[PDB]
C-alpha cells in the first residue's frame, strides 16, 4: 500500500526521512574513523594511547 503523503496529513502523518548506521568491531582491523589528529609514537614511556 502507498502512504499518499498530503500536506493536510499534518504533523502527525508527515513523512520523515530516516537513515540508520550500523557499527561492527573485532572482526577486522579499523579502516574508517572520525577526524582525530594522528600523532607519532613513543617507546618505553608508559603512555596512554589510542
Amino acid at each position: 500500500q502507498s502512504y499518499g503523503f498530503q500536506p493536510t496529513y499534518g504533523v502527525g502523518y508527515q513523512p520523515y526521512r530516516v537513515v540508520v548506521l550500523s557499527f561492527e568491531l573485532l572482526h577486522a582491523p579499523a579502516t574508517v574513523c572520525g577526524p582525530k589528529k594522528s600523532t607519532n609514537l613513543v617507546k618505553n614511556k608508559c603512555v596512554n594511547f589510542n
Binding site: 573485532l26 572482526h27 577486522a28 582491523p29
Partner: peptide
C-alpha cells in the same frame, strides 16, 4: 567418487595473533 578429508580445511578464523 568419494574420499576421506582427513584433517584438511582448518583456517585462521580471525585476524588476531595468538
Amino acid at each position: 567418487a568419494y574420499t576421506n578429508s582427513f584433517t584438511r580445511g582448518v583456517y585462521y578464523p580471525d585476524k588476531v595473533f595468538r
